[PDB]
Design an enzyme around this catalytic site. Structure first.
Site, PDB file in Angstrom:
ATOM      1  N   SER A  15       5.330   2.871  -0.066  1.00  9.02           N
ATOM      2  CA  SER A  15       6.713   2.674   0.197  1.00  9.02           C
ATOM      3  C   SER A  15       7.374   4.003   0.221  1.00  9.02           C
ATOM      4  O   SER A  15       6.841   4.989  -0.309  1.00  9.02           O
ATOM      5  CB  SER A  15       7.389   1.759  -0.851  1.00  9.02           C
ATOM      6  OG  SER A  15       7.283   2.283  -2.161  1.00  9.02           O
ATOM      7  N   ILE A  69       0.812  -1.229   0.000  1.00  7.32           N
ATOM      8  CA  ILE A  69       0.000   0.000   0.000  1.00  7.32           C
ATOM      9  C   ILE A  69       0.835   1.264   0.000  1.00  7.32           C
ATOM     10  O   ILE A  69       0.281   2.330  -0.238  1.00  7.32           O
ATOM     11  CB  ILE A  69      -1.034   0.036   1.146  1.00  7.32           C
ATOM     12  CG1 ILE A  69      -0.334  -0.049   2.489  1.00  7.32           C
ATOM     13  CG2 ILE A  69      -2.043  -1.104   1.030  1.00  7.32           C
ATOM     14  CD1 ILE A  69      -1.285   0.009   3.673  1.00  7.32           C
ATOM     15  N   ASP A 107       8.114  18.152  10.753  1.00 11.25           N
ATOM     16  CA  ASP A 107       7.982  17.610   9.393  1.00 11.25           C
ATOM     17  C   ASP A 107       6.624  16.987   9.103  1.00 11.25           C
ATOM     18  O   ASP A 107       6.495  15.984   8.420  1.00 11.25           O
ATOM     19  CB  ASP A 107       9.061  16.585   9.057  1.00 11.25           C
ATOM     20  CG  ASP A 107       9.371  16.553   7.544  1.00 11.25           C
ATOM     21  OD1 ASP A 107       9.106  17.539   6.798  1.00 11.25           O
ATOM     22  OD2 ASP A 107       9.962  15.565   7.115  1.00 11.25           O
ATOM     23  N   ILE A 119       8.792  -0.548   2.888  1.00  9.39           N
ATOM     24  CA  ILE A 119       7.544  -0.870   2.219  1.00  9.39           C
ATOM     25  C   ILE A 119       6.522  -1.148   3.304  1.00  9.39           C
ATOM     26  O   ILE A 119       6.827  -1.789   4.329  1.00  9.39           O
ATOM     27  CB  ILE A 119       7.682  -2.117   1.295  1.00  9.39           C
ATOM     28  CG1 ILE A 119       8.706  -1.830   0.173  1.00  9.39           C
ATOM     29  CG2 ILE A 119       6.352  -2.533   0.710  1.00  9.39           C
ATOM     30  CD1 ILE A 119      10.022  -2.583   0.342  1.00  9.39           C
TER      31      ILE A 119
HETATM   32  O1  LIG Z   1       2.131   4.363   3.770  1.00 13.38           O
HETATM   33  C1  LIG Z   1       2.939   4.468   4.719  1.00 13.38           C
HETATM   34  N1  LIG Z   1       2.707   4.081   5.984  1.00 13.38           N
HETATM   35  C2  LIG Z   1       1.510   3.583   6.534  1.00 13.38           C
HETATM   36  C3  LIG Z   1       1.577   3.153   7.855  1.00 13.38           C
HETATM   37  C4  LIG Z   1       0.451   2.712   8.519  1.00 13.38           C
HETATM   38  C5  LIG Z   1      -0.743   2.711   7.826  1.00 13.38           C
HETATM   39  N2  LIG Z   1      -1.981   2.339   8.190  1.00 13.38           N
HETATM   40  N3  LIG Z   1      -2.854   2.483   7.181  1.00 13.38           N
HETATM   41  C6  LIG Z   1      -2.250   2.948   6.113  1.00 13.38           C
HETATM   42  C7  LIG Z   1      -2.920   3.235   4.822  1.00 13.38           C
HETATM   43  C8  LIG Z   1      -2.324   4.060   3.875  1.00 13.38           C
HETATM   44  C9  LIG Z   1      -2.955   4.240   2.659  1.00 13.38           C
HETATM   45  N4  LIG Z   1      -4.116   3.662   2.333  1.00 13.38           N
HETATM   46  C10 LIG Z   1      -4.686   2.886   3.254  1.00 13.38           C
HETATM   47  C11 LIG Z   1      -4.121   2.622   4.491  1.00 13.38           C
HETATM   48  C12 LIG Z   1      -0.830   3.129   6.480  1.00 13.38           C
HETATM   49  C13 LIG Z   1       0.309   3.555   5.838  1.00 13.38           C
HETATM   50  C14 LIG Z   1       4.353   4.932   4.537  1.00 13.38           C
HETATM   51  C15 LIG Z   1       4.619   6.292   5.240  1.00 13.38           C
HETATM   52  C16 LIG Z   1       5.300   7.082   4.168  1.00 13.38           C
HETATM   53  N5  LIG Z   1       4.477   6.569   3.097  1.00 13.38           N
HETATM   54  C17 LIG Z   1       3.467   7.395   2.498  1.00 13.38           C
HETATM   55  C18 LIG Z   1       4.005   8.273   1.381  1.00 13.38           C
HETATM   56  O2  LIG Z   1       4.960   9.025   1.599  1.00 13.38           O
HETATM   57  N6  LIG Z   1       3.332   8.276   0.217  1.00 13.38           N
HETATM   58  C19 LIG Z   1       3.590   9.218  -0.878  1.00 13.38           C
HETATM   59  C20 LIG Z   1       2.290   9.894  -1.316  1.00 13.38           C
HETATM   60  N7  LIG Z   1       1.239   8.912  -1.600  1.00 13.38           N
HETATM   61  C21 LIG Z   1       0.151   9.269  -2.383  1.00 13.38           C
HETATM   62  C22 LIG Z   1       0.227  10.358  -3.250  1.00 13.38           C
HETATM   63  C23 LIG Z   1      -0.860  10.720  -4.020  1.00 13.38           C
HETATM   64  C24 LIG Z   1      -2.056  10.019  -3.958  1.00 13.38           C
HETATM   65  C25 LIG Z   1      -3.227  10.433  -4.777  1.00 13.38           C
HETATM   66  N8  LIG Z   1      -4.353   9.720  -4.641  1.00 13.38           N
HETATM   67  C26 LIG Z   1      -5.409  10.150  -5.351  1.00 13.38           C
HETATM   68  C27 LIG Z   1      -5.368  11.242  -6.184  1.00 13.38           C
HETATM   69  C28 LIG Z   1      -4.158  11.882  -6.263  1.00 13.38           C
HETATM   70  N9  LIG Z   1      -3.072  11.505  -5.568  1.00 13.38           N
HETATM   71  C29 LIG Z   1      -2.124   8.921  -3.107  1.00 13.38           C
HETATM   72  C30 LIG Z   1      -1.044   8.550  -2.329  1.00 13.38           C
HETATM   73  C31 LIG Z   1       1.020   8.023  -0.464  1.00 13.38           C
HETATM   74  C32 LIG Z   1       2.292   7.307  -0.138  1.00 13.38           C
HETATM   75  C33 LIG Z   1       4.686   5.107   3.067  1.00 13.38           C
END
Ligand SMILES: O=C(Nc1ccc2n[nH]c(-c3ccncc3)c2c1)[C@@H]1CCN(CC(=O)N2CCN(c3ccc(-c4ncccn4)cc3)CC2)C1
Ligand SMILES: [Mg+2]
Length: 355
Positions: A29, A27, A146, A34
């Site tokens: 990284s 989900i 941050d 990851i």
């Molecule tokens: O995802 C990370 N850590 C965790 C930890 C515990 C969690 N519990 N539940 C979730 C969760 C996340 C997403 N979806 C469902 C459940 C967790 C995620 C790590 C922390 C750092 N990282 C996130 C990150 O920096 N991302 C970059 C941006 N990204 C992103 C960017 C744009 C869009 C987007 N979506 C729709 C339209 C436009 N843009 C979606 C995600 C998400 C991942 C990976």
């Protein structure tokens, strides 16, 4: 025991996990590792599992992994991601390589929420929760520095949790991963000192992006970042400039001058629900809150407690959330430790095993 683990390939990585965790799916990284969603067959619910690969490999990774383990263990607050389990598949300090952190599974990342229009009730509630999480960290002497949307997650019911604990009191990595700097306060950008309300700038940046669906200050580096800030908000006052050391002041004073824009022009009514009288009044209040967060000079910027009490936010105020007993952190040198690779390896192993 060792037979109670199994392995699956997740992209270019191998996840070796306890057999209770099933149906892994990636989900997210990042630099730190990851994260997969999984079904916990014992709890009968889905969870998130993060793999930290050799977190002791350098001091930046090591400090962050160690502090996040310790903090996740001592913090118990609904707006901070919680620890469900931690394990290593290696059976000895000698063989130790990887740490797996098991957390609550949310439904989306705040970056996805930013791509959606939000009503005032949802927008204010999300902000309220951010502020409760931040205040709770502040109550233990933790200033995040941050905060950013990628590290904030939400459920369909509009509940929100912050995923990380920030910069501590400190970063070079060999990596293709890039640090997102767009939410960092002027006093971080310019290398000034900071206080608790450094975090309110970041909340402002996130709120403003929730409203306009664009990153406010998408700088490619700190020089670009500062230009973007002053283009929108205006060159700061002489009282601010005087607070800067000469090397930085000469730089800041010698940039072209910008008048900036009013908050009415930055965040017009068309960006908010503003049909009904209720929505009009809430739009006015939202803009007022933004105008108090997005303030370059931190001495004049809103505090967490003033934000919690602001008219846009305070409809949600509950002292069990906003005035919770502070976390008790057991490692009194948490933010100051300097260690070798081998030393960090032992410290992390002991946290993981509880030793
Ligand atoms: O995802 C990370 N850590 C965790 C930890 C515990 C969690 N519990 N539940 C979730 C969760 C996340 C997403 N979806 C469902 C459940 C967790 C995620 C790590 C922390 C750092 N990282 C996130 C990150 O920096 N991302 C970059 C941006 N990204 C992103 C960017 C744009 C869009 C987007 N979506 C729709 C339209 C436009 N843009 C979606 C995600 C998400 C991942 C990976
Ligand atoms: Mg991230």
């Amino acid at each position: 025991r060792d037979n109670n683990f199994y392995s699956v390939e997740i992209g270019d990585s191998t996840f070796t996990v306890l057999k209770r965790y099933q149906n892994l799916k990636p989900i997210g990284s990042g630099a730190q590792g990851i994260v997969c969603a999984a079904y916990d067959a014992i709890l009968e619910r889905n969870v998130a599992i993060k793999k930290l690969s050799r977190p002791f490999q350098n001091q930046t990774h090591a400090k962050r992994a160690y502090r996040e383990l310790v903090l996740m263990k001592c913090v118990n607050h609904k707006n901070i991601i919680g620890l469900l389990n931690v394990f290593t598949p290696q059976k000895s300090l000698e063989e130790f390589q990887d740490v797996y952190i098991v957390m609550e599974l949310m439904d989306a990342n705040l970056c996805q929420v930013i791509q959606m229009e939000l009503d005032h009730e949802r927008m204010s509630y999300l902000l309220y929760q951010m502020l409760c999480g931040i205040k709770h960290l502040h109550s233990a002497g933790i200033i995040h520095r941050d905060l950013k949307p990628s590290n904030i997650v939400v459920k369909s019911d509009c509940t929100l949790k912050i995923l990380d604990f920030g910069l501590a009191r400190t970063s070079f990595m060999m990596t293709p991963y890039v640090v997102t700097r767009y939410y960092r306060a002027p006093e971080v950008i310019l290398g000034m000192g900071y206080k608790e309300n450094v975090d309110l700038w970041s909340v402002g940046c996130i709120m403003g992006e929730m409203v306009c669906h664009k990153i406010l200050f998408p700088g490619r580096d700190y020089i670009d970042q500062w230009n973007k800030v002053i283009e929108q908000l205006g060159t700061p006052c002489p009282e601010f400039m005087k607070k800067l050391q000469p090397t930085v002041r000469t730089y800041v004073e010698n940039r072209p001058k910008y008048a900036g824009y009013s908050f009415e022009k930055l965040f017009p009514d068309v960006l908010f629900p503003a049909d009904s009288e209720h929505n009009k009044l809430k739009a006015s209040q939202a803009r007022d809150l933004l105008s108090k967060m997005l303030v370059i000079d931190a001495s004049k910027r809103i505090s967490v407690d003033e934000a919690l009490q602001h008219p846009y936010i305070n409809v949600w105020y509950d002292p069990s959330e906003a005035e919770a007993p502070p976390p008790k952190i057991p490692d009194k040198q948490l933010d100051e430790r300097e260690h070798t690779i081998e030393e960090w390896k032992e410290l992390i192993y002991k946290e993981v095993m509880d030793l």
